[PDB]
Amino acid sequence: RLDPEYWKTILSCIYVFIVFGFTSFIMVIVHERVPDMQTYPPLPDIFLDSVPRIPWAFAMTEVCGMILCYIWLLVLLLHKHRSILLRRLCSLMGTVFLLRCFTMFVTSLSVPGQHLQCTGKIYGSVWEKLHRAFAIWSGFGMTLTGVHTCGDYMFSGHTVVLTMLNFFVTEYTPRSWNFLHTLSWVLNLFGIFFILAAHEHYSIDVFIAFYITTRLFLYYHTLANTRAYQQSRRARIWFPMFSFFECNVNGTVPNEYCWPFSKP
Amino acid sequence: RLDPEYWKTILSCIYVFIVFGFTSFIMVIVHERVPDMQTYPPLPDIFLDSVPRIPWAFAMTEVCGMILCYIWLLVLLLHKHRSILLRRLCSLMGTVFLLRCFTMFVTSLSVPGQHLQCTGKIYGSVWEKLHRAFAIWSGFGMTLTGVHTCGDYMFSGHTVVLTMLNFFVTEYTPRSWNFLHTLSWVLNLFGIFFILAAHEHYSIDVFIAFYITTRLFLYYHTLANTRAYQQSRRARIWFPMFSFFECNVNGTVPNEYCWPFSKP
Amino acid sequence: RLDPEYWKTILSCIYVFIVFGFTSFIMVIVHERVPDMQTYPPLPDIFLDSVPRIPWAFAMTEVCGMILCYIWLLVLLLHKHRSILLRRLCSLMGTVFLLRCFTMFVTSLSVPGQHLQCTGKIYGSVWEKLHRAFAIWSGFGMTLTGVHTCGDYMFSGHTVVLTMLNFFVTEYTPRSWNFLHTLSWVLNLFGIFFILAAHEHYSIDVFIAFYITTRLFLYYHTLANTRAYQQSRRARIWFPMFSFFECNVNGTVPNEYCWPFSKP
Amino acid sequence: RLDPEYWKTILSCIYVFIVFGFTSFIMVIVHERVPDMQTYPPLPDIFLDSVPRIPWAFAMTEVCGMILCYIWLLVLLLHKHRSILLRRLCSLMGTVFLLRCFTMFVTSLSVPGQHLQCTGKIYGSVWEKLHRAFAIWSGFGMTLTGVHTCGDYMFSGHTVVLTMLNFFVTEYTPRSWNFLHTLSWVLNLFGIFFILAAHEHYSIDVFIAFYITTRLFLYYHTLANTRAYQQSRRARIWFPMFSFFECNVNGTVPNEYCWPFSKP
Amino acid sequence: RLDPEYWKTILSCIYVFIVFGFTSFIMVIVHERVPDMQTYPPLPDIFLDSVPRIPWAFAMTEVCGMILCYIWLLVLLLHKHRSILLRRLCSLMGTVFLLRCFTMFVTSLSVPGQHLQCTGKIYGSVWEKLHRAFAIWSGFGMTLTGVHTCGDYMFSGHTVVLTMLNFFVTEYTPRSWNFLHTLSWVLNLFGIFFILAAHEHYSIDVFIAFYITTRLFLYYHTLANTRAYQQSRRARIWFPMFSFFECNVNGTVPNEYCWPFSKP
Amino acid sequence: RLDPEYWKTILSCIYVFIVFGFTSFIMVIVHERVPDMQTYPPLPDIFLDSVPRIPWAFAMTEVCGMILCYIWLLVLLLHKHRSILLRRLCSLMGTVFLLRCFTMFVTSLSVPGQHLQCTGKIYGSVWEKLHRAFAIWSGFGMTLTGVHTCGDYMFSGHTVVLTMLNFFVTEYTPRSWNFLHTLSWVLNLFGIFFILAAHEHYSIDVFIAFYITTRLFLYYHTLANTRAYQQSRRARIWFPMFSFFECNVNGTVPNEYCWPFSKP
Ligand SMILES: CCCCCCCCCCCCC/C=C/[C@@H](O)[C@H](CO)NC(=O)CCCCCCCCCCCCCCC
Ligand SMILES: CCCCCCCCCCCCC/C=C/[C@@H](O)[C@H](CO)NC(=O)CCCCCCCCCCCCCCC
Ligand SMILES: CCCCCCCCCCCCC/C=C/[C@@H](O)[C@H](CO)NC(=O)CCCCCCCCCCCCCCC
Ligand SMILES: CCCCCCCCCCCCC/C=C/[C@@H](O)[C@H](CO)NC(=O)CCCCCCCCCCCCCCC
Ligand SMILES: CCCCCCCCCCCCC/C=C/[C@@H](O)[C@H](CO)NC(=O)CCCCCCCCCCCCCCC
Ligand SMILES: CCCCCCCCCCCCC/C=C/[C@@H](O)[C@H](CO)NC(=O)CCCCCCCCCCCCCCC
């Protein structure tokens, strides 16, 4: 019997925002490793060399995300298990972004020549980096609300968020509506494809970004359904704060829908 | 009962050899795409920037390759199922190295500046790229038998070979010999330390090459020991020609050793 | 049953402060043997010759030491039988630091050349050696609050404290927390590594300090769990004040946790 | 049942000879590090400063060693299970000398000023270091047949041999002969005192050598008597070639004495 | 049952005092026989000829005397049969010192040359020999309160007192305290080494005085513990009025302790 | 059963002869530490100061020795078990004489002025010392066959031989012949008294000699009758080769007489 925990989702909600600030701080520090990073010519890519750069191609990437999260917002609203759905999204987005920091600290791979006119540079001090980090944190990295002036590094987060939201939408709906599922899938592919057409991330930048989110999503649900957190000392699951969130939930979550408002 | 099939092993051994030649050939094609790739400054790193270059560290990586191969050859001869072990080795190196070809064609990445004096280049025709391919193919990519004259590309194969031969040694010996397993782990780690200290491959090319082989190794034997190729249509295995190779075997291969010669 | 003795622990806490004062006096007598101990050329070591001196490496060891002290303090606050744990830590640090005084008097082995600028010296009298011993005594020997002005001698005390605290954290916590157990081990090995990297002790001064604390901790616990202080006359236990402290404790101390304050 | 294995003692003797040769070579290499090692002022010791040097105090140690070796050989002659006794001494001496090599490599601690007149030195090449190692090997390191011409390093080997021979003489004699035991103990302590009084080693070197030999002997005999090599997977015994030698011996070796000669 | 008698103790207590004055009085008489006793060269020895004189080694003997007496006084207070213990102290010390007076009169032996400077001498009459005897009697022969200013004769009394107070401490404590017993043995041996190192008594003076007290102590307790005074006419006890002192006690005195004060 | 072994007597007889030579060898070395020892004045005694020197007092002291052993020889000649008495004389005289060597090495006490005309001295060599020792060995120390020309040291052997012979004659006769026992006792005192009257040994020289022989005699017989060599591990009797001689003898020996010859 699952117990709706309205106090644990608060801890899960706080956890994801702390990781968001940490990632913004890291990308500022790694930015000053090399001063210029606009003189190199782009590496030979099979995709970035054929299609010409489209300046407005990236502008539609977050457009699909807004529709995707809006659709996900409604199914969250019309789902009775509001604590579990929100807590399983914050406990996964907070894990992938930690893997984003590790893979960009060891090496830095950007696109040499696009968005070459972003100003700032030589942030040599202790305190003025935080002001830049604060803008990154409370800007969502959007280009409409211009904060991300020039390009980003390996393991792009635009693919992470687009793919992560798609999987919750697809399988948290009744298995008889195979018309919305293909609508979510087609939007995700165009968003990923538009990233490459904007000459902002390499071809290998997205492939390992799409694989990590997909593998981590399936590994989490399989262990949640099998209920291995207390069945046996199998492998000491390495997910950050996993058993603390799934201890009160046993079995597979149902998909019963109702109406929250008391004014029909 | 496990029936030794000596005619399928011959076909599998041919399959893996075709991959090496095909993989070597595309190395010339991608090298022709870039004029030099030996002038640019290296991208910022965490390990290639701290330690200085060690000229003799590249040879020590392949010195440990013989030890792992020599031990594996000894284990192969003293195993009753010689046709079974050799078929999986040729069926795994064929798949992993096939992915190496794919990741090289989609994106090109190398460390800019070591081994910049390799001669030849600009082989513009059809009738000497094979000549260079044959020289590399019939040199096993070693540096002692110098064929690998200058730089290599992303997803280094010097780590795939070391890791694959490390897991076969531990897997196919009795589960009480955990000292050779310890020795086979020290050799693998040192072979990875020296390939990085020699300034030959980035810190991220090694990690994504130590993970793919490990993941593809456990997944292959899990599918075998569980025997899911005929129990049920679990996932429609994507391994190239997996149902053909392992159809005639049932259960798990034991770990008892025999002697083929009749002169004790 | 475990009877919390609040009068034996006070005797155990006093016993430590006598030993620490005694050790702080021996370090003054030993320092007067050799006048200079700063002109000799250093002995040929394998770790002190490769890694160059890191100026900030010794201030980081005590940073890793305070964190282990903060974690241990929380364990002592939330434990049912906090009296016995406090009595066992004070009964073990008073024994190892007695072995440090013995090996320092028998032979003096310092590092010839760091802290060569420390002034003072030639305290030839009885009346100010006690003053010098008090300065080291009420500074805990730490390098942050400047007391450790000159060099240090054999059987490093920094390694004894770090290893003793680390083994207490992983012993008196539930055997399902294999992330704090791994975190403490990481903090222990980095604290030891920064002692060698700061050129503060030889490679053999730290190895035998880590061994003795590890051996004496395991021996003490395997001797009290089997209630060997009264089971028979096995070997006439040589631990200082062993039967006096543990005669009221029978069997193994459980791992019950509670909250002492009555204000939820 | 105790089955006398006559084909393993040869392997043990070969292993010991290889270990001795490796120790001689490592000693030569270590001595090659520091050129002079004879101009330094000696460290302040408590035994090397009080008792003045005795010129003849180093031959008495080898006299006691030869007496103990003769007694041990006499014990070996009239024992039923002489093969097992000969197989146990070698497997312990090899391990202790490997530990000696390891502790000699990390740090070099010699006595600065005895044998300052020894000539030779600066053997810089590969071709005569082997000759010097062969001389030290087939000179047994003794001072009677002059090979020990220059100084000696940490973890003295005379104390190891004396303690091992004394412990083997005490162990495998009937438990009613408590006068030969006292004689052997007196010989061992006199040998140690004569090593210390000849200004050949520091006090800490002798103390750690004695402790290590005693602890290793006791641990090995406890493991052999408790029959832990096949009882369970207790700790994966780290003794080199332990389970290979004692697998044919079950229980504790009795103390039956006989006469191998059939000519009364 | 043991009945403590407080009347026999008073009579036994004054027995030693009349003997102590008699022992002091006989010293001047034997001293008057030979005038100088401070000019001849010493007899050949094995210990007085190797080690040199240590001026402060004579005081350290009596420093250890206070500790043995201080511990014994504590035992004599926290005991329940305090009347029994003190009677045997006066009964044994009186007999041994009575022999000490006898052995000087039959033969006089001393160390020729130590303490040659004492003034006075040639006290030929009856009315100041007692005065000199009273000075030693009221000074207890100590050197801190200097009355024993120059040399001592056969059968040194510094060994009798140290050994007698050693055997009462170990015997009249519960047979589980074998650490104070170990301390009481180290305290005795050091006192025996310092009296010899001060060139105050020959190497045979100590041994024939360490044996008589030990033999006379073991004989007294075995003769009493087995209760041979009234069981049968075993040997017609030669001890001075041994039967009178121990007639009222049967069996062995237990080792239980009481507390006389009524203010816990 | 009292089994007479004629082969153990020979081993016992050889043992006493080796000690006889060893004692003579010590006498030569001990004489050389002091050059003269003939200038000192004799120590003031209670007996040597009154009784004048008698030149013929030592003439007849050995005469009693022949008479005493002649009577003992007749008792040995007319005993049923001659072997057991012979091994109880050699195994007891061979222990006392070893105690004579120990007391002469630690100190040297002789009479300064008698036998002052002894010649030779200063035998500084390695080889010709034995000729002096050989004369002492094969001279039985007799003053008639003059070999022992010069003075003698502590623990005179003249009292040892007289007392040991006296006790064997006494208790190895039936307990109804208390007329010869008095005669043997009378001879012993006169022989001892003349030794002290010959100004050859001090008063304390003989008393310590009389006690040691008597105590060791009674301690041997009590242990032989009690049969403590195999009854229990009581005290590990310290007599040399004691259990080896009494293992085959059970109980106490009777005193029956017979005739050895077969020709009445
Ligand atoms: C609690 C779950 C909320 C998840 C919603 C997305 C949050 C992620 C926003 C940035 C996270 C900070 C760290 C990433 C920094 C950038 O290096 C990163 C990679 O280029 N940019 C984005 O993620 C660009 C973000 C692309 C996301 C578009 C999908 C639609 C989300 C809209 C919700 C945000 C409200 C703002 C509406 C205008
Ligand atoms: C019994 C099974 C043995 C199979 C062992 C692996 C065979 C792989 C043959 C590779 C032939 C060329 C294809 C690779 C081209 C390079 O882009 C690649 C990465 O730089 N280099 C290597 O793989 C070469 C790296 C070499 C380092 C590993 C050393 C172990 C090799 C063992 C084979 C011994 C044969 C040596 C004969 C000279
Ligand atoms: C039973 C209580 C244990 C508490 C922690 C251990 C305290 C032991 C301090 C030793 C006192 C002086 C005796 C030794 C002197 C030196 O020869 C010795 C070796 O160089 N120094 C240390 O051990 C110095 C090593 C210091 C590393 C430990 C750091 C943790 C200190 C915690 C105290 C926090 C107070 C901070 C207030 C600002
Ligand atoms: C299983 C065989 C055990 C036999 C006895 C032990 C042999 C070990 C000899 C080691 C050979 C050289 C390696 C070590 C060299 C030195 O770093 C080391 C101390 O400095 N030497 C010894 O320990 C040398 C110790 C010397 C003291 C022992 C004396 C007994 C020797 C018996 C041989 C008799 C031959 C005599 C012929 C004239
Ligand atoms: C409670 C029972 C205590 C009885 C302890 C024994 C009492 C012995 C008193 C000796 C009286 C004079 C006779 C001895 C004369 C000297 O030729 C003799 C040897 O040279 N010296 C000692 O015996 C002197 C021995 C030196 C060693 C010190 C041992 C004395 C400790 C007891 C006295 C404590 C008084 C302390 C007051 C400050
Ligand atoms: C196991 C059989 C033992 C029987 C008797 C053996 C006596 C041996 C005594 C001398 C042995 C040499 C070691 C001692 C050397 C001297 O430092 C020692 C002390 O002065 N001399 C004597 O004891 C000399 C004291 C001698 C007194 C009489 C001893 C009885 C001897 C009877 C034999 C007479 C044969 C004479 C034929 C010419």
From Swiss-Prot, chains A, B, C, D, E, F:
E.C. code: 2.7.8.-
Q: What is this protein called?
A: Sphingomyelin synthase-related protein 1
Domain description: The SAM domain is required to retain SMAD8 in the endoplasmic reticulum.
Q: In which pathway does it act?
A: Sphingolipid metabolism
Q: Which GO terms describe its cellular component?
A: cytosol; endoplasmic reticulum; endoplasmic reticulum membrane; Golgi membrane; membrane; plasma membrane
Taxonomy-wise, where does this protein's organism fall, top ranks first? Eukaryota, Metazoa, Chordata, Craniata, Vertebrata
Q: Which UniProt keywords apply?
A: Endoplasmic reticulum, Lipid metabolism, Membrane, Sphingolipid metabolism, Transferase, Transmembrane, Transmembrane helix
Shown portion of the whole protein? 144 to 407 of 415
GO molecular function (one)? ceramide cholinephosphotransferase activity
